[PDB]
Amino acid sequence: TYNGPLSSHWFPEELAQWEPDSDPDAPFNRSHVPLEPGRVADRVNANADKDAHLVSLSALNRHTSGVPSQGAPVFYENTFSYWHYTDLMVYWAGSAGEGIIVPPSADVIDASHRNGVPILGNVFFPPTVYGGQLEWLEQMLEQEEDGSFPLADKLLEVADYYGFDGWFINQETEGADEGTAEAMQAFLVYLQEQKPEGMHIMWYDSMIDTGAIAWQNHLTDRNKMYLQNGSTRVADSMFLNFWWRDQRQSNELAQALGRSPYDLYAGVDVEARGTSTPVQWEGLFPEGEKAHTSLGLYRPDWAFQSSETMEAFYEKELQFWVGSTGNPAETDGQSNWPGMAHWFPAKSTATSVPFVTHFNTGSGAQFSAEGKTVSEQEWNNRSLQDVLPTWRWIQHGGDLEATFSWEEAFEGGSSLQWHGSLAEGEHAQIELYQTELPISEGTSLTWTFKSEHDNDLNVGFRLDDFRYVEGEQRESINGWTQWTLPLDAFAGQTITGLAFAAEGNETGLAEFYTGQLAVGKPAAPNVNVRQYDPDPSGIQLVWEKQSNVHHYRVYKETKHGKELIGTSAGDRIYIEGLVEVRLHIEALSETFVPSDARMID
Amino acid sequence: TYNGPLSSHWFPEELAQWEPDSDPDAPFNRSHVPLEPGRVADRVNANADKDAHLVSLSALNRHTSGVPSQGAPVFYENTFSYWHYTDLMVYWAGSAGEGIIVPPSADVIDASHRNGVPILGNVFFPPTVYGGQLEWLEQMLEQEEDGSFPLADKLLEVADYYGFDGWFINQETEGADEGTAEAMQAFLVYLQEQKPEGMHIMWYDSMIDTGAIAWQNHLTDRNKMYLQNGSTRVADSMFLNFWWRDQRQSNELAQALGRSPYDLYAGVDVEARGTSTPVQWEGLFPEGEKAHTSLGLYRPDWAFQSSETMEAFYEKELQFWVGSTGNPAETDGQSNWPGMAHWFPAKSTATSVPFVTHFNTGSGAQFSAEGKTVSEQEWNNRSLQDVLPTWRWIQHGGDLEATFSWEEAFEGGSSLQWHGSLAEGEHAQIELYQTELPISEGTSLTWTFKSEHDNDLNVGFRLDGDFRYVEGEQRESINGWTQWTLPLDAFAGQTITGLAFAAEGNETGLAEFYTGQLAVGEKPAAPNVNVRQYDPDPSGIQLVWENVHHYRVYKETKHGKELIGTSAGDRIYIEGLVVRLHIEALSETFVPSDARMID
Ligand SMILES: CC1=N[C@@H]2[C@@H](O)[C@H](O[C@@H]3O[C@H](CO[C@H]4O[C@H](CO)[C@@H](O)[C@H](O)[C@@H]4O)[C@@H](O)[C@H](O[C@H]4O[C@H](CO)[C@@H](O)[C@H](O)[C@@H]4O)[C@@H]3O)[C@@H](CO)O[C@@H]2S1
Ligand SMILES: CC1=N[C@@H]2[C@@H](O)[C@H](O[C@@H]3O[C@H](CO[C@H]4O[C@H](CO)[C@@H](O)[C@H](O)[C@@H]4O)[C@@H](O)[C@H](O[C@H]4O[C@H](CO)[C@@H](O)[C@H](O)[C@@H]4O)[C@@H]3O)[C@@H](CO)O[C@@H]2S1
């Protein structure tokens, strides 16, 4: 039923002749959210080291084809929220039936970028048993007299146009001779020479020097020529196959090659069993020694795909990325699954003012504006996913639980729920964010919450022990309480952490929903109605995207008030069925100040 | 004489009808060096604070017109080297006779960017006494039914295409009414709404709310609408005029406006007297409490324009930016001119591996490759200016002096000279760089020097968080220069926060070092080069090509290979061709590619 723009995918011959200017969908697939530079690490877990990196190969979209460019009316969508333990994201996709070169969709590029995570697209040369064809490989490996590889040029051009950070190269098609192998090496090297600074090409350990498919599970003499060859750099990293018990040898070989052992990502296959995946952790993270290499997670989206509901999906992600403890700071290294927080510092991109979050998880059963439902429809749009709490979860005192709620929202479709038993006079704190926010005059702390039992919600901030204080100026907005705490008295200081605290009352119960937290007015959007060629009877709204803007909201007038029908963090939005009606487009600033609405007939 | 591409400059009606695709010179005026993000500050001066910023309005080129796009065969050029005390650089230019909208030339954009300094172009509405015309102002302020300002669009387009970071707006043309004033405010507001993130529009404290020209010398009720109007942002900063004795009031007013006092730049006019400029420093930097606002330096290029020689120019810049002490760490706050180091931390963009410097100052009397002269001609090309020492100069022990030398070079036209008396058995160190360089396996320290008296030159590195002085591991001789390599694998996972050198005196009692390369950290593919017409000059041509620090163009002669051109962009204009050429690409590590041959 969906006739809108779709995220792209290609077989090599379609890519060759692909031009953004001629692709009706290309403008919808561009990310307009740059990779946030300079994340800051936390230090709450004593066992976590600073050397090892982590890549995730995640099916952020279950399918390669049929993915709407910019979100969809579906609550249950893969709203991964553990960007903070991730150094590199690989968009897992590609199939013999749909296309083997697949960039990440723009919604996911955006989510990744807000958390300063570089995201790679996938070039998937499938095993013949899965419809793999040598032809496709040979096509990609075509070389001009020039020496250049035209399809490599297309990889770079796609990554440049759509706005992501490189490619994962997965060569599992059998039948390749040694000449093909050398050509692949030339192809990867050509990538290195031509790519923009920062771009990352990650090679899967599969095709060896002979062209045979022969996973090494380590960096060996059989595969090292795909990472580094003497003084020539071939690839930025290698994802090691799963069948290893120890990685010391790869570390040693990497040093002999003059490369960091941490450009090797020891692979762990978690697709089927997630946290029940058996792993020789000592083989990667030895006892008094630093990590032998980095870590590669194949398919953490297990959490999504083995679950039926958003809540079970979110619980499995916590258990997987943080561990059975539910506390990043208190991990059980003796557990079968200690969790990623056991080994990896959490990073935060809350490093710049203004810092704003509405605890938007990226989807919802409903959409709220200033605490009022403005659409009752399921939606996902991971471009609207906020930077979520560094820690999941760190509390002190009370018998409380913290989770995301999709029942209450102030902006978007979720809130942070903090609820349970808190005895009278008892104090509880929840430390949420590692940060690096320079305070200057005019800088305020605001936050917005509901409280079912009337307890007030204090804010907590840590300066370069948390300071817990109550807000200065209170305001009521559709049932929500918004505090503003001026921080002028602290100008010149730097906030390195954000938190909340509450005091129990006679009730003995606490139930908070917090829908905005921030440390820190756009022009009405200039909007044009254009054809979306592939769908007459549909249209697209196109504006000039302002850098002061977090995203755009499209309302349509109804007999029952204004209804939200669209959101975009790009420069356009496709609306179906319009040819067949008054619209209102507002731009919301980074601080979520709404502009005056442009009217469109 | 020179018929090559020239740095641009417009009156408003020329800008209106400008499009890059039709300008033969536009491609030569594009910067290909992005603004380096994330500089790191030093801590060596106890009095320096972290709040106040500093803008320089510098005539990096003496003239608006006649500026070659990419360097010129002139040694004495304004090779400003104090980017480290500068937060914002404004390219000072514009005149009634030449053009009043002028972007920075590509060479200067590049130098600025390498040091992570945002550089602004100039929009100069001149006083009528200087040929100013209200017309030009009215032209710039034209508004469509749309509400948009077409010439503002051209300012943003120029900045985008050429690769710089905004504009300084200088409105000193008399005769403007209150309507013009409001239009200017709308123009500045339109800029804010349309500009790319990061871009900076700085407004001069001149035209007040009535449109009259009435410098306030402070942020007042008469000019605040040009910075901020309620919740609307009008400009990113204001450069306050010079006639102030104190700035507390502007600080206070800025707070009431909900803006940082440090978006205000208290102006100091140093054009005529440089370090002899009288300043009420206490009025800006109160003996305790913070600085009231930021600092605005009008014309530090006094150092260049009041001097006749590179050496005198370089000495005056030291005396101006560092002080009479010659030591950023030991400043005399009681001096008439304590120097900028007295108040401002030095920043460094040595924050990423590979870090490479050849101590190229941007010009030379001569050009060297691997220590051999490959051209005897004066040159300047500030696209080749390296990130130069954070500290000028910090030494311990000996009776030594450090300066730049244009007599000895390993790559380019200059080296760092460290020379004087060092008694046998004595030690001396010179701390050169504040850095932030993650060490990983495969990472080496290299350095390259000549020593007139045979002392060896040790490298110094400080780890996060006293320097480690060690001697190199592998020695190499290259055309009279010694190159040490010191593997740093034993330190992988550590971070270098500082680089230095150290020497031990010998029986000679003398030391004379010239150091031409220092680096913490693969040869490029031969450039794919085409010969194209440079339309405005038949009998001239341009080489155009598509990792790489810069390109070198050699021509074959009866006397060997001669360097005739360098470019950090995608092309170079060569005059007189009409002859075998050789184009090599040099990597960031200065590994040369195989030369493309061109006939
Ligand atoms: C890097 C790495 N690359 C391989 C990775 O490809 C491999 O993955 C597995 O991939 C199987 C094949 O996928 C392709 O072909 C399928 C059928 O035509 C398509 O549906 C698919 O989208 C691809 O184009 C895949 O079928 C595997 O899934 C099956 O087994 C799983 C257990 O591992 C299970 O969880 C599934 O639900 C399913 O039955 C699988 O994801 C991995 C693992 O073998 O190794 C390297 S890592
Ligand atoms: C921001 C700030 N803007 C003004 C700034 O413009 C002003 O500068 C002075 O500017 C004078 C006028 O310059 C223009 O007109 C000249 C003549 O047609 C041109 O040659 C020029 O390039 C411009 O288009 C200028 O003449 C002043 O220089 C003279 O006095 C100097 C002392 O300040 C002296 O050092 C010179 O050698 C010369 O005789 C001067 O640079 C400043 C200072 O008044 O105020 C604000 S800051």
Residue numbers in the entry:
A (entry chain A): 2 to 465, 469 to 524, 529 to 588, 595 to 615
B (entry chain B): 2 to 466, 469 to 524, 528 to 552, 556 to 587, 595 to 615
Task: Provide passages from the article that reported this PDB entry.
Endo-A from Arthrobacter protophormiae is modular in architecture with three distinct domains. Domain 1, with residues 2–350 being identified, is the largest and displays a typical (β/α)8 TIM barrel fold, which has been observed for proteins belonging to family GH18 and GH20 of the glycoside hydrolases.
The Man3GlcNAc-thiazoline could be regarded as a transition state mimic and was resistant to Endo-A hydrolysis. While the thiazoline part of the carbohydrate moiety is buried deep inside a hydrophobic pocket formed by W93, F125, Y131, F169, Y205, F240, F243 and Y299, the mannose rings reside on the surface. Analysis of the structure of the binary complex of Endo-A with Man3GlcNAc-thiazoline reveals that E173 is well positioned to carry out the protonation of the anomeric carbon. The structure of Endo-A in complex with Man3GlcNAc-thiazoline reveals that N171 may be the essential residue that facilitates the intramolecular attack on GlcNAc during substrate assisted hydrolysis to form the 1,2-oxazoline ion intermediate.
